[PDB]
Symmetry: C2
Subunit: 983 residues, 2 copies
């Protein structure tokens, strides 16, 4: 019955969507984009009277009349979802509608949403019109509100809106009065629009973005279209065109384009839809992600007497974006799209501050991302100004996702066209003059059909200079870019070798970054970096969508689906957390991998004797003469043998060779590493000149027989093997025990999020009972200084998981060799997570030192990043707080590892080749069992894992699982570890 | 054992307490006091790593070493008590120590606080030294932290501090390094200092005020003493003296005193404790609360080459403060101290923003308060800058209150002298140059003894130009002002008529403003305004100390003692809420009374025929020629008969007569009101020219027989009396019922907070069972159009509370007269709350209109404020949300009241003299029962009360209960109401 139950009720009395035309005070203000400090702007953000009900019948219907008294109401902060200020229920669900549930007495039935279970938040505040605004036109702007609202000013109805992610505006000039004014919005949690707002995110309510007033003369700048292109022959001369829509009602409109040095470079004047003259800048400064060169465009209306009545403006970037000869190109250069999807998220909900937005782009740039896709809705206006300013390509996207709904698709019901086209026009209008926006996207998981054909058609008709994509379009005409998402390496290869294609393969979403993830990233990039027509894609995604809480003991933790509300509250668990960073922008390990693979200066060692390196310049518009190579050779002892700085010139996409020189490795050193690091000669305000923007390490075998790390005999070793399990049950040094538990064979790791979906993952492990192993002795032979045990490896059901031979040999050294031979019964063991030994030490042994890949967590299918070296750390520092606790803390390519107390007591452990290890504060049982961070408890011991083999992590939570070279072999295998007690 | 278990461990390595000597960039910065934007200042506020334990043994001891890893810790906002960010437990107790309780396994035992139950919050963050600070001296400043902390920088111990309300500072210059610095504070909830921090407030923890760094040259301004007095002969020539302490190590120190027009008026130069020359300003601009005239003092160190190396400064106010001929005088004029006590409080705890502080002083000034007492601790530095700027006298007070502890007093244990004198020096040093500070106070509920004798002695030795008071001193020498608090009108009169006294009586705390309160305020002021030597006092207090929460249905409410923690958590209930405003600075009714009695222009009607008024000018330094009188005569119909503006000259403290002129009242009008209102000719930035700063109304009897409000016969009335109760059980108008319940006699009101302590209050009422009354018919006589019932009034125990005669008479009018005669059995009924009728109407009758004192809640002993007039309102608007729900909504001096639906249906009710009424959304049972606002539920009806008599509210929660003229008489009484149905 009411408006928010209709898919047509998308607005009433709003202004036509347009570009932001904030009136500024001063051309100098226009260059800074500093419009909020304008005398013609007034925020309505702040504290507002607020009221909440479940059931629109029980609401205070008359709260919008100035006479209705709201003094006994609470305040609520605006902007900010009300779920994060103590009201109602935050719900996370995924491919479903949270309201399509029994808790709400409703089955989904578009365009209808629940009625009696629907929620109303009534907002009201008062305000004074600034004195200086006398006789001016005043516009009310609400930057975004979810889901549907009525709005009143002074008790006069303005109208209503659906569409939560772009501004709605009303001209409220004739509704204002003297003295105290009031403003009211009545906000519904659900309307028909929610069916198009079924994004993979928190389902939240209320006023999400700024609410404000701005004021213009009776005659104003209503809109304007900026064209700043390059000629398509050499891409060197700028093309400048400008149209200005003047609204209302002798006078002139004039523009001035100025360069970074405030010098005027183009300028026009006319005495309503004014079309200025086409103009040309030769040898113009061009815009792109690496050199975001900008101009400032000032637009002024003038009195019949030549006085300035209004000034507005925007940054201008001369640049082109196109699909050329089937490849996506910026300024005539086909580029690799190294990007990420970004959702808007903070502890306040959908509401993101300027500092958090700046944090976002600062970290992105620091980790070699060059493009961002706006996860299924346009973003806060300020995000685009950041991208123009610091250089990111934006793939902007209409707020349209009806995942919850083939033949019943909302893409094919023409009665939803008005909603679709409204959402699309609004996305286009507000951002059309940003150079940072390179691609328009039509929506997300909303199906294909006539609605997206009209959307595509319309968009193409007004936009000639940006590609338009749509992922659900697949190969149909209505998409300019083949977006297909989460495809496997093979599927990309099936595509690019076809001869009847004309569109680049660019992954809209790929490499699902959920929990301990982003395995197989190297393999994707071997393809992109070699296929002229798979140009990369956008990682899913940037930031975990989580909320930090604190339990009754002061233990903090991350929340996700099911965590707020009653017991059977709709919920898709932790699947909203998929980020390269945690919710407060602290990076996850896998993000360091992304910085490594996304780097723009890649190198190989081409000649070991001269140390000659081939350097490939993956930049699109930067010469390597902007950077400085630092190189150095270092021995396993941590002694720099040769170091230098170097300066190479090399053009984008070109390669270049560089000889470093032979370097004499001593005979006492066992191996050496050649490290290459690159930094910039000039800072940006985001990256200083000490920040390592690309690196590479290469292993140099040397002649030493022993690790300069090997300790010397440190007293008298004893040990004991268990009659029953065959496990090493004791190891002393002059009587002092070193083990807090026996050494046994482990085959299992507490599931990562991926492990839980992986075809070869924890589903198999837990079902074979690998997380519950015991050893039984079949035969045990002992001498004074050695032992050989043949054991059965059983799960808790008693089933034999495999056969093993455990060989303990005390060396004349005092070191103990442990050589293990294991073979799983591959008749019913289809997978193992790892192959190695595990044991506990008392938690005083927290000084961990190792020679291995570091300083951060790496896995065999995620370890291009990091550098082999000597590193100091602790089990507390190694444990990474993934939203659900899972395996963490792995080190790869390990030569040796030490665990010691501060007193110096401990052991130094080596193998016969590079191994993997971890050492964590929490046991495996506990870590597997914990569902939230605060569930973790310490038991006085650390758990050490020594692995000959452990699986990669892959990305199975969505898309490819661990690739085959990274699975753990099931053949008979033998691996050995040698423990050297120390003092 | 550890430092915080000792009362001597008050600091280590701190700088000597001093005045704030922030280095500014610019003399222009110095005038604005804008030091936070200085290049030599850097905030450390923001997000910090945080960790919390119960039990100092279980804490992360090494968190202060740069090597200790805190990446898996949460963040916490600084500043702000941690209890308000999800940690530990907020506790409110009063004259007790929260730790002296069984929950904490501890009995109070100074100087020891609990050990295993004590709480540790470890805070750490990193920071970069600004580049420009190379070679500069750097100071760390923590403006306040509760209770005891250790602090480290870069792993170097700085020292520790006790004393939560003034800054601690360390010179950290040699502890800084290149790159990332770290800072650590380890904060304890309790130390020995807590025994002196037993204020009536929330017991809270952590970093409460700003933490920051400032930077000076090796040679700096360490301190300085400003003297700006007036000659004690005419108080017209300014006396200026300045001492500057220069620390560290050719150079000159120079000052310039400048007036509001940046013109230099005094200035010196010298080539370390520099004493400048005594100087004199004739006809200087003088400082006081009404005209806070200021000068700006700039102090500059200069190079041997005359270059500026450091600039600092402060505002200067030429003014004197003294006890002259036994009276407190500002600038030779004895003033009335109209003030309030202020605690620091927001939703963050003890932490108060600039906007909230400005809100505080803005409302205070708007309600004619001229002085503020700092409730038992010095305040945030910025508070003093507000008082200098806008004009408030400050009574500043050392952070010393050991209420929890006669002969065992901490005032008499000399081992606590170091704590006492430390707390006192610190209060003195930081504020000595503020003109707004007029009185120093020694502490609060801490007893008298040798410690306060040394404190008093010391203070007197360094301070010659401000009185020093101490409330627990009583009449002993160590107090310059007789502060005795909460004394009755009589006790003040016993004092001021003594001839052996030499000290003014100034109430340190009086008129406890808890719940529905501030009764008897007129009577206090009749005394102050007539006793040259009782000069007023400070209301307790300014702001409720409450926290707003939201329950599971979106119902907000205020919290108080017992509301956080387990069940038997220490608690003194709602006694922390005693304010003239609620916690978010919305005023309580009683605050409008304070504006009325504190007003500075008081008037009486001296001649009714000419309308001649006597005007008394209670200002101390303002002529009435700064104001504008608006006057007007108005008839009970709401028709202005005469109005005008007037301009009078009258000197402070002098009186003046003013004839308004005779005015002809029509013969149709029954009474007229003469309203006088005053406004200022010139705005301050706090009070515009439309704000009514003082008013007065006078009643003018006229000849009309009827209220121009009386309706005309509106159809056919019927009614019904109950066979059993004698109650009016029905009243219809053409068949339509008007009552939702019977009309019965009420004697009780849901207890106010005062009612619950009052000698004549709810203790008596509830014990006589007055809240549970029934009527039983003794005899009932009926005719067609009238009824007479003799009833017994019984409590629920069946005991006869009194006898009543109920007389119902239907008038030829259709109006029903109800005449009630009641007499309580004064053998065991010692008190009644009111005498009147009560009944319910369905809640559609929400349109209330009345001719009475309004627009706000008044009681017979709190009704000097407001104006009789015609007012529109609703039961929802009438209900005031006192922290615990209690009686509210009373109107006094009522001629008639109407209750109608929007359709216009209802009744118009009059009496035979002024009565009282209320009409509320919640029943009395429910209102009495509710302990928190969200407990209140609506039942579909409003409760109307028509009172012939109701008690005052008094101030018994602390101090005098309802005064005798305001008690409800227990004699036989007869009162009548006439109900006129309307359509
Ligand atoms: K887990
Ligand atoms: K109550």
């Amino acid at each position: 019955q009411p408006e928010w139950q209709s898919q047509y009720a998308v607005g009433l009395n709003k202004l036509d969507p347009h570009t932001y035309v904030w009136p500024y005070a001063d051309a100098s203000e226009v260059e800074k984009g500093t419009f909020e400090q304008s005398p013609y702007y007034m925020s309505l953000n702040g504290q507002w009277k607020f009221h909440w009900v479940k059931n629109p019948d029980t609401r205070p219907k008359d709260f919008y009349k100035p006479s209705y008294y709201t003094g006994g109401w609470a305040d609520i902060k605006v902007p900010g979802n009300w779920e994060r200020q103590g009201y109602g229920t935050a719900i996370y669900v995924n491919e479903t509608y949270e309201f399509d549930d029994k808790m709400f007495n409703f089955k989904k039935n578009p365009p209808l949403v629940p009625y009696k279970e629907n929620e109303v938040g009534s907002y009201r505040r008062t305000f004074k019109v600034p004195a200086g605004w006398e006789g001016r036109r005043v516009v009310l702007c609400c930057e975004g509100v979810i889901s549907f609202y009525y709005v009143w000013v002074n008790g006069e109805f303005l109208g209503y809106n659906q569409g939560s992610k772009t501004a709605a505006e009303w001209d409220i000039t004739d509704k204002l009065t003297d003295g105290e004014n009031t403003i009211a919005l009545e906000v519904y949690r659900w309307s028909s629009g929610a069916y198009l707002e079924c994004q993979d995110m928190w389902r939240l309510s209320g006023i999400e973005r700024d609410v404000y007033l701005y004021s213009t003369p009776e005659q104003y700048i209503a809109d304007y279209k900026v064209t700043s292109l390059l000629e398509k022959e050499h891409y060197k001369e700028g093309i400048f065109e400008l149209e200005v829509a003047v609204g209302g009602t002798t006078s002139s409109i004039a523009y001035t384009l100025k360069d970074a040095s405030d010098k005027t470079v183009l300028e026009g004047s006319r005495k309503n839809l004014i079309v200025f003259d086409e103009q040309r800048l030769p040898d113009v400064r061009r815009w792109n992600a690496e050199h975001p060169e900008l101009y400032t465009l000032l637009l002024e209306l003038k009195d019949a007497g030549g006085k300035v009545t209004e000034i507005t403006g925007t940054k201008v970037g001369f640049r082109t974006s196109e699909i050329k000869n089937g490849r996506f190109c910026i300024n005539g250069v086909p580029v690799l799209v190294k990007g990420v999807n970004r959702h808007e998220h903070s502890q306040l909900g959908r509401t993101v501050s300027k500092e958090l937005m700046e944090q976002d782009i600062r970290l992105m740039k620091q980790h070699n991302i060059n493009t961002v896709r706006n996860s299924h809705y346009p973003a806060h206006p300020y995000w685009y100004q950041l991208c123009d300013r610091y250089g990111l390509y934006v793939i902007d996207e209409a707020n349209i996702e009806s995942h919850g709904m083939g033949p019943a698709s909302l893409a094919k019901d023409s009665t939803w066209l008005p909603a679709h086209i409204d959402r699309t026009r609004r996305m286009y209008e507000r951002s059309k003059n940003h150079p940072s926006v390179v691609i328009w996207s039509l929506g997300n998981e909303a199906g294909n059909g006539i609605n997206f054909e009209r959307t595509y058609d319309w968009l193409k008709s007004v936009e000639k200079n940006r590609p338009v994509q749509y992922e659900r379009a697949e190969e149909n005409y209505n998409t300019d870019i083949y977006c297909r998402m989460y495809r496997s390496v093979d599927v990309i290869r099936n595509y690019v070798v076809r001869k009847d294609i004309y569109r680049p393969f660019i992954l809209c979403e790929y490499l699902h970054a959920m929990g301990n993830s982003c395995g197989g990233m190297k393999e994707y990039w071997e393809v992109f970096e070699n296929e002229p027509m798979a140009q990369g894609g956008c990682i899913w995604d940037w930031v975990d969508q989580s909320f930090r809480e604190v339990d009754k003991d002061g233990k903090w933790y991350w929340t996700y689906g099911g965590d707020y509300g009653p017991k059977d509250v709709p919920s898709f668990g932790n699947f909203c957390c998929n980020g390269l960073v945690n919710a407060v922008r602290e990076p996850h390990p896998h993000l360091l991998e992304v910085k490594k693979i996304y780097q723009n200066i890649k190198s190989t060692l081409i000649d070991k004797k001269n140390l000659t390196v081939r350097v490939k310049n993956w930049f699109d518009f930067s010469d390597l003469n902007e950077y400085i190579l630092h190189w150095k050779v270092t021995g396993d002892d941590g002694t720099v043998l040769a170091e230098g700085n170097k300066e190479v010139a090399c053009e984008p996409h070109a390669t270049v060779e560089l000889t470093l020189g032979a370097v004499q490795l001593p005979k006492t050193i066992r191996e050496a590493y050649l490290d290459l690091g690159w930094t910039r000669k000039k800072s940006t305000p985001l990256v200083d000149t000490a920040w390592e923007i690309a690196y590479d390490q290469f292993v140099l075998p040397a002649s030493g027989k022993v690790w300069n790390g090997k300790p010397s005999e440190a007293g008298k070793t004893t040990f004991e093997v268990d009659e029953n399990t065959g496990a090493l049950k004791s190891l002393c040094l002059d009587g002092e025990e070193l083990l807090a538990s026996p050494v046994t064979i482990s085959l299992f790791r507490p599931a990562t999020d991926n492990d839980n979906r992986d075809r070869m993952g924890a589903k198999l492990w837990r079902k074979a009972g690998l997380h519950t192993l015991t050893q039984k002795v079949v035969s045990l032979k002992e001498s004074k200084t050695s032992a050989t045990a043949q054991v059965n490896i059983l799960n808790v059901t008693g089933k034999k998981v495999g056969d093993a031979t455990l060989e303990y040999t005390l060396n004349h050294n005092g070191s103990l060799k442990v050589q293990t031979t294991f073979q799983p019964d591959t008749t019913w063991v289809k997978s193992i997570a790892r192959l190695g030994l595990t044991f506990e030490m008392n938690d005083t042994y927290g000084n961990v030192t190792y020679l291995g890949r570091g300083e951060h967590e790496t896995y065999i299918d995620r370890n291009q990043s990091g550098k082999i070296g000597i590193y100091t750390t602790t089990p507390e520092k190694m444990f990474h707080y993934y939203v659900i606790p899972q395996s963490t803390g792995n080190r790869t390519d390990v030569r040796w590892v030490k665990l010691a107390d501060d007193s110096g007591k401990g052991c130094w452990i080596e193998s016969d080749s590079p191994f993997q290890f971890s050492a964590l504060p929490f046991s495996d049982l506990l870590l597997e069992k914990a569902l939230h961070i605060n569930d973790l408890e310490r038991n006085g011991r650390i758990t050490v894992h020594l692995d000959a083999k452990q699986a990669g992590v892959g990305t199975a939570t969505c898309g490819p699982g661990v690739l085959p070279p990274y699975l753990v072999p099931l053949g008979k295998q033998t691996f050995t570890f040698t423990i050297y007690p120390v003092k």
